[PDB]
Amino acid sequence: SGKIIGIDLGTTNSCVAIMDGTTPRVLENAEGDRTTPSIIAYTQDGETLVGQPAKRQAVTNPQNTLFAIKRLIGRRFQDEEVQRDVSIMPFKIIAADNGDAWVEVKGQKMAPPQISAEVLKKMKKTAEDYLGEPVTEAVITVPAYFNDAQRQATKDAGRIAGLEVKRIINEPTAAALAYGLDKGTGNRTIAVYDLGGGAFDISIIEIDEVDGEKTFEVLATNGDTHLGGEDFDSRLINYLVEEFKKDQGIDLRNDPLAMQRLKEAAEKAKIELSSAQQTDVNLPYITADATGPKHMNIKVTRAKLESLVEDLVNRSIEPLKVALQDAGLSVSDIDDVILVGGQTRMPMVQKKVAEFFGKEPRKDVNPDEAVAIGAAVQGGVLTGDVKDVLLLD
């Protein structure tokens, strides 16, 4: 009964959408925001916080504020990704008795789906508050590269949240369904360039209209699972650490609190530089010793940021070339390019993509919302708010 909600369960941010007839709507959460940080905190007084309230208390509760769980879900403890993360994450990653990668909080061992379920519960409650009725059914997205274990673990997170998971849909296909509502009629071949907080994906997708059905077919996919916005942040963090050392002679990498503050400040400055030519990073009392307190104040220009991440943006191009080769297409066979993911808002990324294809990406696809909207469209196809759509093998 009710609506089948569409959920984008992201590395960095999650969001929820519904179909109101032919019109998708992305829903704002209890904090008023159309996206929710994928952050789950277990507080000293026993509450579970999700989203911005969790983000806001991370500095004072670092061992019990969980994030980036999408990097662990469905994985084995000795997976190379997991082993890297054990060393860098401030929370405790452990081996379950069966060999899976788990987390431990205040002595309680938890599987990754038990943590991502808290985000899904917030998406469910958001939709219930908006609609005035219970929500029990959902479509949840996953990256195209996810394996069976990762897909099943995501389905399990939905069940833990009290949702019947009607379908798992791949993120590029969801973006294509969002585009396909307001697209030109007939045959179209699109390139979906998705640069999120954790991973990069390029998919070539063909849309057709035949025998009264709109068909969608993935012609090729490629990507880099170690290329995401968090890597852009890391380059800026490293610059700030190096500049502070050069100027003040102190290495902040030894101080976890300082490094947590730098991570937040670096991400804020990076986002600011998508619309400004320069910005300033100010962190009072970033460290202190017997000589006195030290305050960081560093100007970062857009040119400097571009130089720090140029090679990351360039790493996204070779997969583009291979995906076209695999699809048997040249760049002149692509009708539209769709940017998906918050990190595509960087002007340098937009310019490099346009230069590669020789045409500007579509402006009427919101890179932050397309995946959630596509999940909602799939939910409409299952009910009947949306008719005549077929996903081809």
Ligand X SMILES: Nc1ncnc2c1ncn2[C@@H]1O[C@H](COP(=O)(O)OP(=O)(O)OP(=O)(O)O)[C@@H](O)[C@H]1O
Regarding 319 and contact with ligand X (CB under 6 A), the answer is no
Helix axes 148-160, 112-131, angle to 10 degrees: 50
- DSSP assignment of 224-271, as one string? ETT-SHHHHHHHHHHHHHHHHHHHH---GGG-HHHHHHHHHHHHHHHH
Strand partners, 41: 49, 65
Interatomic CA distance for residues 153 and 168, integer angstroms: 11
Question: Are the beta carbons of 212 and 220 closer than 8 angstroms?
Answer: no
R_g of the chain, CA atoms, integer Å:
22
> SS3 of 274, please?
coil
Segment lying near ligand X (by CB under 6 A), choices 20-28, 54-62, 183-191, 268-276: 268-276
Known active-site residue 333: no
> SS3 of 53, please?
helix
Q: Which residue is nearest to K ion (CB)?
A: 10
Q: CB of 370: closest distance to ligand X in angstroms?
A: 9
Regarding 341 and contact with ligand X (CB under 6 A), the answer is yes
Segment lying near K ion (by CB under 5 A), choices 11-19, 44-52, 95-103, 110-118: 11-19
Question: Are the beta carbons of 240 and 296 closer than 8 angstroms?
Answer: yes
Ranges within 54-93 binding ligand X (CB under 6 A): 70
Interatomic CA distance for residues 310 and 305, integer angstroms: 8
Question: Are the beta carbons of 352 and 317 closer than 8 angstroms?
Answer: yes
Residues 6+ apart with CB under 8 A from 14: 7, 8, 35, 36, 37, 38, 119, 122, 123
Regarding 13 and contact with K ion (CB under 5 A), the answer is yes
Per CB under 6 A, the list member of 51, 172, 229, 361 interacting with ligand X is 229
Known active-site residue 255: no
Residue 170: count other Cβ atoms within 10 Å of its Cβ: 22
Q: Which of the listed partners (Mg ion, ligand X, Na ion, none) does 342 bind, with a CB threshold of 5 to 8 Å by partner kind? A: ligand X
DSSP state of 116: H
Known active-site residue 8: yes
Known active-site residue 201: no
Segment lying near ligand X (by CB under 6 A), choices 109-117, 196-204, 214-222, 283-291: 196-204
* Choice between 113 and 214, CB closer to ligand X: 113
Q: CB of 96: closest distance to Mg ion in angstroms?
A: 27
Question: Are the beta carbons of 196 and 343 closer than 8 angstroms?
Answer: yes
| Residue 243 token pair | 């500049």
Q: CB of 59: closest distance to K ion in angstroms?
A: 23
* Choice between 10 and 223, CB closer to Mg ion: 10
Regarding 24 and contact with ligand X (CB under 6 A), the answer is no
Which residue do the tokens 């704002």 mark? Answer: 28
Per CB under 6 A, the list member of 73, 142, 174, 199 interacting with ligand X is 199
Q: CB of 371: closest distance to Mg ion in angstroms?
A: 6
* Choice between 67 and 188, CB closer to ligand X: 67
Residues 183-212, one symbol each (x = binds Na ion by CB under 5 A, - = not), give -----------x-x--x-------------
Regarding 36 and contact with ligand X (CB under 6 A), the answer is no
Regarding 113 and contact with ligand X (CB under 6 A), the answer is no
Q: Catalytic residue among 8, 100, 233, 369, which?
A: 8
Strand partners, 168: 140
Per CB under 5 A, the list member of 6, 10, 143, 180 interacting with K ion is 10
**Residues labelled catalytic:** 8, 70, 171, 194
**Which stretches of the chain bind Na ion, using CB under 5 A?**
194, 196, 199
